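Q: I'm a student working through a structural biology exercise. My instructor gave each of us a protein and asked us to get a predicted structure, then write a short paragraph describing it. Mine is Maltose-binding periplasmic protein, Islet amyloid polypeptide fusion protein. I'm not confident about reading structure output yet, so if you can add a plain explanation after the tokens, that would really help. Here is the sequence I was given:
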Amino acid sequence: MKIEEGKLVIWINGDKGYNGLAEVGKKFEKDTGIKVTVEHPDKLEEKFPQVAATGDGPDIIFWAHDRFGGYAQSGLLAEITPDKAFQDKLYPFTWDAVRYNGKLIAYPIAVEALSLIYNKDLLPNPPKTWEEIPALDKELKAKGKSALMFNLQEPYFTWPLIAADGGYAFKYENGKYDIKDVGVDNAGAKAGLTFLVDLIKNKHMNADTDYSIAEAAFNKGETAMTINGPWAWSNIDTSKVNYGVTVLPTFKGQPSKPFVGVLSAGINAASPNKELAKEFLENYLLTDEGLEAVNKDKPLGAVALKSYEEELAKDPRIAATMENAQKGEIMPNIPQMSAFWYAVRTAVINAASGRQTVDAALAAAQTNAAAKCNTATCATQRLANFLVHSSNN
Ligand SMILES: OC[C@H]1O[C@H](O[C@H]2[C@H](O)[C@@H](O)[C@@H](O[C@H]3[C@H](O)[C@@H](O)[C@@H](O)O[C@@H]3CO)O[C@@H]2CO)[C@H](O)[C@@H](O)[C@@H]1O
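A: Happy to help. First, here is the predicted structure for Maltose-binding periplasmic protein, Islet amyloid polypeptide fusion protein. I'll explain a few features afterward.
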């Protein structure tokens, strides 16, 4: 079905405040007569380039900024040309995240970083270092609890530890990323992943732990800490756990270095509703009332809109988000990013389960993080996984 003129269809991930975004859509329809339909399909960031290539899909797509360079390189995004006054309503660093080859390719919404979230009743003094976590888990285990649970299935969550002692994605030099210099298999990456693998070998974490499992355990008071972003705070508030949000633990004396994402809204190049989409984003969403609706549903983090960011800034959870962001690094947005993420996901999963050694896992990741994907999902490049041998212990 080609995109319908005279309507807006919006895709946003299921962990964000889509019901709040729908309220903004209701206001848009009231004021303009144009219906807005908000959807949260699974794997939307993989599905988008497939449907958009055929002239179909949403008018507006929301994701962290890292996926957008790939979309832009494929010609799937409309150029964004806000006037300089509008640009001035948002922090200039947020616009920098949505630039690709000299053009703006999306509207920035909010800056996201992972923090350490901890249960103040179980653990009034959170650990400053990763190194002290094994001993903390041993102590808490004897008490019927555990130290730490977080999603080990998505590399976003383990990256801060991999990067802490020197892991990196692509070297940046002279204003551009060098896709022939990948840093997932240097001494620092090896050290970080080895520490994670050892936490698992020593039974302080389980390799199968995922987002739902870690969320449930924290929100039910079973584990003292988790690692998550601002979107997760809503469900924690509902649980009534007495929690803090703080700086991530250091590793080998170095700060954990999360990859920072800017939630961004791009416009489908095939949309016959480009001007309506721009009106929705500039005049309705990127306003105090618009972001309030979304943020009240699931917190956005450090919002791009200066006026609303100022209202929220006193929140120590946002302060902690910004503290972790500044110790981290903006995600590249280059087309090669998806290949990087698939490669690192497989490395962490294989190393964590004992399917491969850390050195074997990261050696493979270095090879394939660089490899060029012709598709949004890297399906053929991921066939490399047939080479991996089961442990068979
Ligand atoms: O691991 C497989 C996965 O890799 C890529 O996903 C990455 C995202 O592109 C990246 O933005 C980040 O995603 C996190 C969001 O930024 C955050 O808002 C929240 O939604 O959590 C996400 C992590 O689950 O990190 C992931 C990598 O973990 C790739 O684009 C995906 O297609 C692929 O499934």
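A: Here are two points you could use in your paragraph. The radius of gyration is 21 Å. Residues 13, 15, 45-46, 64, 66-67, 112, 154-156, 229, 261, 338, 341-342, 345 surround ligand 1 (CB under 6 Å). It's a good idea to check both against the output above yourself.
Q: Great, thank you!
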